Design a protein around this ligand. Sequence first.
Ligand SMILES: [Ca+2]
Lengths: 56, 57, 57, 58
Amino acid sequence: YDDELFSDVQDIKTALAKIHEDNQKIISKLESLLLLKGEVESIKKQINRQNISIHH
Amino acid sequence: YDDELFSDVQDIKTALAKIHEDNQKIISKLESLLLLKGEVESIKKQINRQNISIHHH
Amino acid sequence: YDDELFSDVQDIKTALAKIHEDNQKIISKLESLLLLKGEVESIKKQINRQNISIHHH
Amino acid sequence: YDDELFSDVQDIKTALAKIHEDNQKIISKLESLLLLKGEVESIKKQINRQNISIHHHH
Ligand SMILES: [Ca+2]
């Protein structure tokens, strides 16, 4: 083994570690973005509340 | 095919399979986010509905 | 170049191609999502038009 | 270290570099999307302002 297969293999492993870390970052931001769905539901309630007061 | 070399190759295969699984999770979340699109359009209509009510008053 | 080693190397290449394919799908979805920013700005204008409507009475 | 095997290893490296490059772009797009959080918040305030004007208006 090597000559020098081992060094190349290590480099591949180092790259794989970097991509996975990237994935973790991509997932954190998706989770934060998902909170948007609740906010845009809130806007629709806020508009309905306006409609209720105006009717009154 | 040195045994240690095979061990190392198996590790690489294990890493890639994990990355692919993460990709599935990422795509699943994106599909959910896409539904936002319909929700926003509905808000524009809700405002238009409001405008009509105000005119008829 | 051992025959089994070559096959495992081939298996690795197939996996990278699949991950790359996942990437393109992810990018496509994110481009669609970015269209949201224009839609939200449009809502801000639509609400402002209502305000102009109310002032004129 | 067989020369054919070396090419195949180089090929693997090239694909990984390309995937990382894609990862960067995906991240840049997510950061842009995040600014949406502020925009949706701006709308919530804009609606509240209407309610206040209306109260003074009425
Ligand atoms: Ca990704």
